[PDB]
Amino acid sequence: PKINKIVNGTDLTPHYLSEPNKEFKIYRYNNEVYAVRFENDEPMDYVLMWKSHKDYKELGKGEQGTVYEKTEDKAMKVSRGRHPREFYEEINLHIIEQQFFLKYHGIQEHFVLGLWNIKNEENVYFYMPKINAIPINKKIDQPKIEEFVLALKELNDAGYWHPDLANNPYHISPQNLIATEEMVKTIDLDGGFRYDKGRVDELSRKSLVYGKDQWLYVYNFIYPPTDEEDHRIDWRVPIEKWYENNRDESLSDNPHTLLRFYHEGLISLPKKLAHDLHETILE
Ligand SMILES: O=P(O)(O)O[C@H]1[C@H](OP(=O)(O)O)[C@@H](OP(=O)(O)O)[C@H](OP(=O)(O)O)[C@@H](OP(=O)(O)O)[C@H]1OP(=O)(O)O
Ligand SMILES: Nc1ncnc2c1ncn2[C@@H]1O[C@H](COP(=O)(O)OP(=O)(O)O)[C@@H](O)[C@H]1O
Ligand SMILES: [Mn+2]
Numbered sequence: 001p002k003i004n005k006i007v008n009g010t011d012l013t014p015h016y017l018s019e020p021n022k023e024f025k026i027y028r029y030n031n032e033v034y035a036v037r038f039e040n041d042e043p044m045d046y047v048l049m050w051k052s053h054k055d056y057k058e059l060g061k062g063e064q065g066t067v068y069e070k071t072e073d074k075a076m077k078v079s080r081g082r083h084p085r086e087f088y089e090e091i092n093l094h095i096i097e098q099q100f101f102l103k104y105h106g107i108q109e110h111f112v113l114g115l116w117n118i119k120n121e122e123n124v125y126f127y128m129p130k131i132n133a134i135p136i137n138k139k140i141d142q143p144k145i146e147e148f149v150l151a152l153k154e155l156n157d158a159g160y161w162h163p164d165l166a167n168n169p170y171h172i173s174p175q176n177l178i179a180t181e182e183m184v185k186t187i188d189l190d191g192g193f194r195y196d197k198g199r200v201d202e203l204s205r206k207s208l209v210y211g212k213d214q215w216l217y218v219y220n221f222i223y224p225p226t227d228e229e230d231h232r233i234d235w236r237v238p239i240e241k242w243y244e245n246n247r248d249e250s251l252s253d254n255p256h257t258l259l260r261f262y263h264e265g266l267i268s269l270p271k272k273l274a275h276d277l278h279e280t281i282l283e
Pocket of ligand 3: 061062063064065066
């Protein structure tokens with residue numbers, strides 16, 4: 001019911017996307033900034049981007065930017081890079097499409113996407129919902145991490161992956177996982193998700209394999225398999241040997257591999273995935 005009301009809001013598209021635009025528009029409607037997509041010259045669907053309140057406080061800093069608190073509900077990242085306006089416009093278009101993917105899979109809440117403001121080409125910044133981190137307990141809050149991992153797997157299964165969360169089985173960036181009251185979210189997505197572009201060099205092919213199994217690396221790093229002696233198993237050894245001997249293939253594309261390794265005690269799996277896989281056999 002809101003689509004026709006949202007398009008009557010304030011059009012912010014020139015501050016984010018190329019103008020004119022046939023496919024996507026940005027509107028502020030009742031203190032909420034939406035992205036609206038079009039088909040056949042008609043508004044079709046929308047996604048929520050952030051809440052609007054239309055020497056900043058520093059929320060944090062990484063290698064490639066500084067994140068400020070624009071409002072109590074919105075964060076603002078200033079990256080160290082220099083690119084043309086069209087570079088950010090293209091990222092924004094892909095982020096909007098990726099936001100729609102997240103909505104259509106019911107996992108938008110687990111990822112903090114946003115848009116690059118480009119109304120000043122020399123003062124570019126990334127708006128996004130501000131989240132509030134709280135303590136992590138691996139046992140008491142295990143469902144939070146489980147639910148995030150399964151959401152990330154849904155992303156990986158579709159060919160998208162986080163650009164800086166778990167690049168390979170030996171690299172994890174836990175700082176990009178944030179626990180809130182209800183769940184775990186992931187940040188540092190101002191470039192959008194990664195995806196394969198059809199390239200066949202060695203690096204690209206390995207990155208695709210690592211990305212599709214990203215969800216597995218995160219889960220096993222936090223909840224590695226345990227043997228009789230309560231000693232953690234190095235899940236990386238069987239997985240690496242598998243990649244070396246099954247070229248250009250991911251474990252996620254082979255559920256029989258996941259179940260076999262899980263049955264042998266080599267890898268861990270979220271409780272619901274183990275249950276679903278085992279239920280697939282009983283039935
Ligand atoms: O009038 P605009 O050109 O559309 O810019 C406004 C303005 O931001 P700036 O003046 O700093 O550029 C608002 O800030 P206020 O002075 O009204 O407080 C801000 O609203 P927030 O307070 O929530 O930051 C809003 O941002 P939003 O997109 O969330 O509505 C943003 O609009 P633009 O996105 O078009 O820049
Ligand atoms: N949406 C957000 N809400 C609250 N804090 C954030 C948000 N995004 C980033 N931060 C803070 O800024 C820090 C740096 O974030 P960022 O630069 O995006 O990732 P990285 O440091 O991994 O490159 C984070 O560790 C976090 O504390
Ligand atoms: Mn950074």
